[PDB]
């Protein structure tokens, strides 16, 4: 009852116009700052208590960033476009020892988004649904977060069916990429903790903070 897809699309358009791993980590740190600005532009997020805003972002940052560069990469051959303007080719990822997870991103996310021509409004809404994760531990008022999530998917469904009336299964198709996003995000986190453990690979301050306990 107050979650316009126009404000969500606006949030998306407002924040976005040699070792591939090192480049990926640098891009991630860069985008973490941008992610906070994005969240603030999502309706009602800023009205939640600071502690819950922190919880939601710490809980969803990895999936939020993955969804974003994956959609940005729909126009890329076999690779991804980093927010830094750098492209990471599949062969480069493979030659760096991270080909398996890279291939999952290309196959389960990028290719699927390109195939259904997921638009920016839809991406923004899926990210907003991820942001408003009621399962996040520590939330002072999980019911409030759940309420916001419901408002987002209610608006997204309305958007679909009205924009794509001929694709009745589109709304479900969008939501069904979330389990893949959750799995891939978890794997990417594992890689990050390993990079941090090994010592090699520079990890900037905001990215490092997100890897902080809990």
């Amino acid at each position: 009852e107050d979650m316009p897809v126009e404000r969500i699309l606006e949030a998306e358009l407002a924040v976005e116009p040699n070792d591939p791993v090192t480049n990926i980590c640098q891009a991630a740190d860069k985008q973490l700052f941008t992610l906070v600005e994005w969240a603030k532009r999502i309706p009602h997020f800023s009205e939640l208590p600071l502690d819950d805003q922190v919880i939601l972002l710490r809980a969803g940052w990895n999936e939020l960033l993955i969804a974003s560069f994956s959609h940005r990469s729909i126009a890329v051959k076999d690779g991804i476009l980093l927010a830094t303007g750098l492209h990471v080719h599949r062969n480069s990822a493979h030659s760096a020892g991270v080909g398996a997870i890279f291939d999952r991103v290309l196959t389960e996310l990028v290719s699927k988004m390109r195939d259904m021509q997921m638009d920016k409004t839809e991406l923004g809404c899926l990210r907003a649904i991820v942001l408003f994760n009621p399962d996040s531990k520590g939330l002072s008022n999980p019911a409030e977060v759940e309420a916001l999530r419901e408002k987002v998917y209610a608006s997204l469904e309305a958007y679909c069916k009205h924009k794509y009336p001929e694709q009745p299964g589109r709304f479900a198709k969008l939501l069904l990429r979330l389990p893949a996003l959750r799995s891939i995000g978890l794997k990417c986190l594992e890689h990050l903790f390993f990079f941090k453990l090994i010592g090699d690979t520079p990890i900037d301050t905001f990215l490092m903070e997100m890897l902080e306990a809990p």
Binding site: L50, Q53, V54, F206, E212
Partner: peptide
């Protein structure tokens, strides 16, 4: 804890 995130959210 989480110095950076809090600062960016507050500003």
């Amino acid at each position: 804890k989480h110095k950076i995130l809090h600062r960016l959210l507050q500003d």
